[PDB]
Amino acid sequence: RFLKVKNWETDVVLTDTLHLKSTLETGCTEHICMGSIMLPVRTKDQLFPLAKEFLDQYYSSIKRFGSKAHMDRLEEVNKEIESTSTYQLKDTELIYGAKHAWRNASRCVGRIQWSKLQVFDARDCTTAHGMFNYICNHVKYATNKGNLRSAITIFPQRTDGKHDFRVWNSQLIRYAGYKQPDGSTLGDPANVQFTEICIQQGWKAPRGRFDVLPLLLQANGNDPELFQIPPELVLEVPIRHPKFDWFKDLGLKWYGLPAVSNMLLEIGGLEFSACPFSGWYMGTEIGVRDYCDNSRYNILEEVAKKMDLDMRKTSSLWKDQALVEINIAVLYSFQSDKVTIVDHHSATESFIKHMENEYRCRGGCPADWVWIVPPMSGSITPVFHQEMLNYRLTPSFEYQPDPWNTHVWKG
């Protein structure tokens, strides 16, 4: 089967054969599309086929398919599964797996960078303290004084699912949220619940607007423990605007390092439940969503006020106007402090080039349009006009339920 995707801006038509290697499900059927739905303990039995698939891929990527080294490694993994019910990945296979999960991440506009990924192997980690040390080294290395480098840290795989490693935080760096008695929130509304858990776990909340939350870490199925990331390791950029000098008086800042820490890395059937990964921000992630979502810092009002826009009718597009300046501000602030960041035009242009390349070299690029198109100025970015095919390839990054819903407390 061949599938064609067309670009309506340029009339370029590409052909997807890669979707034939797709295993997992989409959520969709012939009768329903779930493309806009946010979220649409293995036996030896299901495991070896998955192991075989991965190693055949691995071994094709290094040009050694059907080699003695390939067949030997197959035999080796076979025996290891039937003996221990699992297996261990060589370092090289871990690295390749991690790179490919990113590459396969259909909702990531940033994948032109997929091959430049520093993989830290934290598979020898046994304790929360160990996890905290690994995570600090990751932050420091990834930050690199503002010259951000992509990285991921891979803690030990699931075994019985009773001994899971987990970073309770959704991202390694995030600001606290405090729901107040009057129903207002101080700080980041997205993070209220997690903030409460942390408080419960004994964190002394500063109760400010931009309190970096403590890491909350579980090793080996144990109850999790709190650690404050050293402040010096947390690079932050104060937000100012190039023309509007009152923009600084809003007191805004953000952190430099986007680092997702709640996802599950699946490689060759193995499940890595703690695998924090980081890159660098696209400006709209902070300036549209983090500041201007209604259920977030929600500063459109205050900014429109200060610009003295006409706020009596939405047809003044006052919101659209405030939104753009806020985003100009984020990009200006990051660049000024020499903290890596990419604007939404640049990021989506790169991504189209990546995708084109991927269709030639690889025969596809699974892509989720709902997520790839930016949350402002959609159609003046080249991705709006690009037909995409969404399908799931392994290795992959998967969502997993928040651990406080499932965790069995030791006490």
Place this chain on the structure above:
Amino acid sequence: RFLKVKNWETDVVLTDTLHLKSTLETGCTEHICMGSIMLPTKDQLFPLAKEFLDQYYSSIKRFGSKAHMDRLEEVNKEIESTSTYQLKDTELIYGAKHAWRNASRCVGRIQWSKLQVFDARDCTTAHGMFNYICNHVKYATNKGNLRSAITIFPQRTDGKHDFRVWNSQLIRYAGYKQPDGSTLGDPANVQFTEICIQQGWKAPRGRFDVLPLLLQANGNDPELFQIPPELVLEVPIRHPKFDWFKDLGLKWYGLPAVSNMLLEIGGLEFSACPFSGWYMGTEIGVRDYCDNSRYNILEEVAKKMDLDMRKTSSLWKDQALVEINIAVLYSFQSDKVTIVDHHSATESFIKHMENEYRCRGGCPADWVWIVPPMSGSITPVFHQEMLNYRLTPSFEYQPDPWNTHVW
């Protein structure tokens, strides 16, 4: 089977049960989602007729009544005898309104039941079609206080006798390739303009030349008519602050009127069924003006604004995009021509969704199309999960007739 949709801005979770009536296919499988692709007999007809008539008589609180069964019989008799059948006016009205109700890409459906339907099933020639269309345009324009409408020409019979409007909208600006390499007017109609020229159009070779209608009655070769200029309401585009905006000399038409689609009611196919409502501002300002394949005026507007076009990171495209869109909305409101902003339109559609979940058990919605093409995440539809599925009656796309026709 029962399906939940969550709004991530409000936590409201609605349960969709209406998709279980889903008739047609989506393009997707369990293996591949095609959510972002633009275009994924007598025996056949009685089920489709019955399905429709069942929902009709159910809509009017008379499911399984003599009148219901009698009509089911009558149509059954007529199909077996004639190989087609005819809708009662009431069925036509209900059908048309529901094709709109079921259009999963339309953000404007809160309005679906206020649709004026013009039964044009007695039309027999292109001149007739032209008369009906002019009357549509006039009724719907309504001196700028625009009103939704559809005009339904006769149904397909043997497909050798289709009625078609070759225009994609009733009202569009022409497009001409220039020896200068560049394109004069609207580049999305260049081919249609050559077919018009080719069929004898006297093009005035300007930038905003209202194209002529090209009408096909009874599968015959289509003919040309110029909509009375006096019936094509236009709006010159000015900005409430930038006085130099006028000098780009942009105008846009008031009436969005989709003419190229096929309407399916109870198995019957109406190939010429132009319909119209009114614009959401971004269709003109973001898409018609700023798309690279369209009038593409961003570069020129940003220059007059004297913004830094040296680097994409100054967001100069975005700054210019907003003003262009302020200017569209401003010029329409000033000339008193109905237009809706994307905030208002999406806010309306969320209220509609809730109504449709409550009163119908769902609302098929295609997020890719529902979320405006600018400022997506500050409109509420961005955070709203949607389920997209195909219900009948429906508007379907259909191939441009120049490819299908024989002369």
